[PDB]
Amino acid sequence: MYNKFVNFI
Amino acid sequence: MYNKFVNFI
Amino acid sequence: MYNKFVNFI
Amino acid sequence: MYNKFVNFI
Amino acid sequence: MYNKFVNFI
Amino acid sequence: MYNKFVNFI
Amino acid sequence: MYNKFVNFI
Amino acid sequence: MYNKFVNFI
Amino acid sequence: MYNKFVNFI
Amino acid sequence: MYNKFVNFI
Numbered sequence: 241m242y243n244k245f246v247n248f249i
Numbered sequence: 250m251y252n253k254f255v256n257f258i
Numbered sequence: 259m260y261n262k263f264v265n266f267i
Numbered sequence: 268m269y270n271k272f273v274n275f276i
Numbered sequence: 277m278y279n280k281f282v283n284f285i
Numbered sequence: 286m287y288n289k290f291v292n293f294i
Numbered sequence: 295m296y297n298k299f300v301n302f303i
Numbered sequence: 304m305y306n307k308f309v310n311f312i
Numbered sequence: 313m314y315n316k317f318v319n320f321i
Numbered sequence: 322m323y324n325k326f327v328n329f330i
Contacts (some may be wrong), residue, residue: 242251246273249258249318249327252261258291258318267291267300272281276327286313287296293320294303299308319328 241268250259255264258267270279288315291300297306302311317326
């Protein structure tokens with residue numbers, strides 16, 4: 241619910 | 250529900 | 259439900 | 268719920 | 277709930 | 286050289 | 295050289 | 304060289 | 313050289 | 322040289 245998982249690799 | 254999973258690899 | 263899974267590889 | 272997990276590697 | 281986990285590595 | 290090996294399991 | 299090997303399993 | 308090998312399983 | 317090996321398991 | 326090896330297990 242409205243979670244954000246963001247990766248810059 | 251309105252989750253965001255974004256990857257820049 | 260309104261989930262986003264986006265990949266730039 | 269409204270959690271943010273962000274990585275710059 | 278409104279937790280933030282952010283890494284610059 | 287600029288190779289990408291990415292797994293979602 | 296600029297090869298991409300990506301798996302969604 | 305610029306080869307792509309992508310699997311959705 | 314600029315190779316990326318990323319796993320989500 | 323500028324290689325990245327990242328695991329989410």
